[PDB]
């Protein structure tokens, strides 16, 4: 039966369909027309709109409400943000943030975090989209207004809130996945409990330090003005360490089934883009080589985090390189590996010769010795690939040239070229007749530039 | 009302004629809401799908000028 039998329920369900499919359109490109209209001169029309929100964030009410004006003007505000055009638009972006950060709009982002303490509501989750879309260039005036405001109008309540924001947020936990596994066997609200808030927190925390503000990375550690001190640098390690155990254990569930389902790929990738994003905001506390910031982060439990991250890479690079259904996943899996070494490279830019910091990086490469040789040997599978397919012994092994030779004339070719051993030729022979010009283009390209920083 | 009237039987008539003349019932034997969304979300990506594309262009919307003018005109002149 298909809605011929009831009458009012047909038109009712049509309404419920029409709202879901047809209504969500994109006429909405007014979002700079309106903000330019409001800044047209007293006090600007836009200027007292932020004077409303800065007052309402200041009257203490011990918690924060929804206030659905705010979620339409801290979003319409943030929808308004090759060498000539790669510097014409840079001045266009720095003008579309002087439209706001002249008007005190670096305060209604920095106050409405300090008012709601630890509440993860959609009140906070639409200022971080504003606080990101203002700092988006790694700006330098706006990073200075936020620091000077946090020293003459001294807030403990901001840094209490940032640890309080960072407290829960997420972890991809598979206990909720297994119930989602079982019920959907006979009949999207698992994934890190709204990951999209967690990316947009640490990406806001990174954009406070881009351009290497050597004061503002040293205001997040000691925080010397206030009475009590929050140490976000040690506390942002501890969020990473909780994401370490998650994506380790979600691999362990897949240790034997080994055919990654579609509901796992869509749930594993969002668990990576938080892990990639949290490593970027671990870089920018270190990169401008502020040695006090990399003292405290060296004594923390970062080293136990990075051990288990290698523990994923030793095996997940192997078993996901077996079918065509994981190549869309395997690129992001390497991109986390590329971004992991980039931060610990930034640990090493203050060594001497026998520096203390590099010595511990030997140690975690000693204390996790047996998991580095799989990833070193995995690159040798795909780095010898480029010339052993280019050698004149193999280019005219069988063919004149077409792009395909055989599987068997492939098989003794690595046995006659005598570079791979027999056990690793079959790892080349997972599925990889073959494709002489595509299999090199598939396999070799994400092998090298990811394998660069390892070297 | 009449748009679902030219839809509730017509697709079902194609169902009833193809039930003898012929995956087929596997898609037309799902739940009601998923079937309604499947019939509706394909019209933008039959001959009935010309009616909705005349509809949504006509449900665009004047006082919308003068309201949005006067609200900012009040704020421009005085604190």
**In chain A, what residues touch B56 (CB-CB under 8 Å)?**
22
Cα–chain-centroid distance for residue A246? 15
In the block, which residue shows the tokens 């009712």?
Answer: A12
Distances (CA, A) of A164 to A56, A117, A169, A235: 21, 6, 9, 10
Q: Are A272 and A250 in contact (CB under 8 A)?
A: no
Q: Are A383 and A416 in contact (CB under 8 A)?
A: no
The DSSP H or E segment spanning A242 is helix A232-252
Q: Do A43 and B37 touch (CB under 8 A)?
A: no
CB atoms within 10 A of CB A17: 19
**In chain B, what residues touch A22 (CB-CB under 8 Å)?**
40-41, 43-44, 52, 56
Mutate to test the interface with A, among B40, B59, B69, B78 (most CBs of A within 10 A): B40
CB atoms within 10 A of CB A2: 17
Q: Are A421 and A353 in contact (CB under 8 A)?
A: no
Q: Are A430 and A378 in contact (CB under 8 A)?
A: no
List the single residue in B28, B44, B75 with the smallest CB-CB distance to A48: B75
Distances (CA, A) of A407 to A398, A404, A432, B28: 11, 9, 10, 45
Q: Are A135 and A202 in contact (CB under 8 A)?
A: no
Q: A196 in helix, strand or coil? A: helix
Give the closest residue to A14 by CA, choosing from B55, B1, B43.
Answer: B1
Distance CA(A275)–CA(A277), nearest Å, equals 5
Tokens of A82: 């090759």
Tokens of A236: 């942002």
Angle (deg, nearest 10), helices A302-319 and A232-252: 30
Which one-letter DSSP state was computed for residue A259? S
> Side-chain half-sphere of A13: how many Cα atoms within 13 Å?
20
Which one-letter DSSP state was computed for residue A140? S
Q: Is B56 on the interface with A (CB under 8 A)?
A: yes
List the single residue in B9, B39, B56 with the smallest CB-CB distance to A4: B9
Distance CA(A193)–CA(A168), nearest Å, equals 10
For this experimental structure, what is the resolution in angstroms?
3.9
Task: End-to-end CA distance of chain A: give it in Å, rounded.
Answer: 64
Q: A108 in helix, strand or coil? A: coil
Experimental technique of record: cryo-EM
Q: How many residues does chain B have?
A: 79
What are the backbone angles phi and psi of residue A362, rounded to the nearest 5°?
Answer: -65, -40
Environment class of A405 (CB within 10 Å of its CB; exposed 0-12, middle 13-18, buried 19+): buried
């Amino acid at each position: 039966p298909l809605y011929n039998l009831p009458r009012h329920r047909a038109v009712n369900l049509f309404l419920q369909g029409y709202e879901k499919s047809w209504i969500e359109t994109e006429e909405h490109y007014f979002e700079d027309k309106l903000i330019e209209d409001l800044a047209k001169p007293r006090v600007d029309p836009l200027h007292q709109l932020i004077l409303l929100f800065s007052r309402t964030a200041l009257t203490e009410k011990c918690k924060l409400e929804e206030d659905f004006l705010y979620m339409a003007y801290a979003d319409i505000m943030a929808k308004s943000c090759s060498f000539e055009e790669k510097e014409m638009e840079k001045q266009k972006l720095l003008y579309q943030q002087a439209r706001l950060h002249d008007r005190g709009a670096a305060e209604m982002v920095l106050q409405t975090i300090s008012a709601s303490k630890g509440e993860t509501g959609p009140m906070v989750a639409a200022t971080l989209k504003l606080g990101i879309a203002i700092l988006n260039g790694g700006n330098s005036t706006v990073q200075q207004k936020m620091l000077e405001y946090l020293k003459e109008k001294k807030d403990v309540g901001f840094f209490q809130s940032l640890a309080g924001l960072m407290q829960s947020c997420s972890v991809l936990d598979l206990n909720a996945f297994e119930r989602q596994n079982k019920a959907e066997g006979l009949g999207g609200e698992k994934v890190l409990q709204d990951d999209e808030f967690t990316c947009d927190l640490f990406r806001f925390l990174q954009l406070l330090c881009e351009g290497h503000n050597s004061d503002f990375q040293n205001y997040l550690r000691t925080q010397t003005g206030n009475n009590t001190t929050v140490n976000i640098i040690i506390s942002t390690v501890d969020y990473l360490l909780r994401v370490q155990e998650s994506i380790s254990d979600f691999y362990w569930y897949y240790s034997g089934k080994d055919v990654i389902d579609e509901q796992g790929q869509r749930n594993f990738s969002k668990a990576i883009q938080v892990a990639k994003q949290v490593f970027n905001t671990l870089t920018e506390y270190i990169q401008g080589p502020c040695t006090g910031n990399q003292q405290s982060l060296a004594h923390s439990r970062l080293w136990d985090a990075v051990v288990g991250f290698l523990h994923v890479f030793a095996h997940m690079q192997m078993k996901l390189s077996q079918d065509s259904s994981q190549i869309e996943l395997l690129k992001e899996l390497m991109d986390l590996q590329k971004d992991m070494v980039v931060m610990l490279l930034s640990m090493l830019e203050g060594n001497v010769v026998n520096g203390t910091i590099g010595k511990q990086m030997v140690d975690m490469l000693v204390e996790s010795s047996n998991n580095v040789e799989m990833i070193l040997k995995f690159f040798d599978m795909f780095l010898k690939l480029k010339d052993l397919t280019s050698s004149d012994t193999f280019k005219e092994y069988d063919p004149d040239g077409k792009g395909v030779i055989s599987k068997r004339d492939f098989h003794k070719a690595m046995e006659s070229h005598k570079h791979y051993t027999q056990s690793e030729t079959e790892f080349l022979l997972s599925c990889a007749t073959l494709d002489y010009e595509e299999f090199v283009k598939r396999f070799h390209e994400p092998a090298k530039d990811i394998g660069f920083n390892v070297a | 009302d009449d748009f679902v009237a030219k839809l509730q039987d017509n697709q079902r008539f194609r169902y009833n004629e193809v039930m003898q003349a012929l995956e087929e019932i596997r898609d037309q034997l799902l739940d009601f809401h998923e079937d309604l969304m499947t019939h509706c979300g394909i019209e933008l990506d039959l001959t009935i799908r010309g009616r909705l594309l005349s509809l949504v262009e006509k449900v665009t919307y004047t006082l919308q000028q003068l309201i949005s003018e006067t609200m900012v005109r009040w704020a421009q002149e005085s604190v």
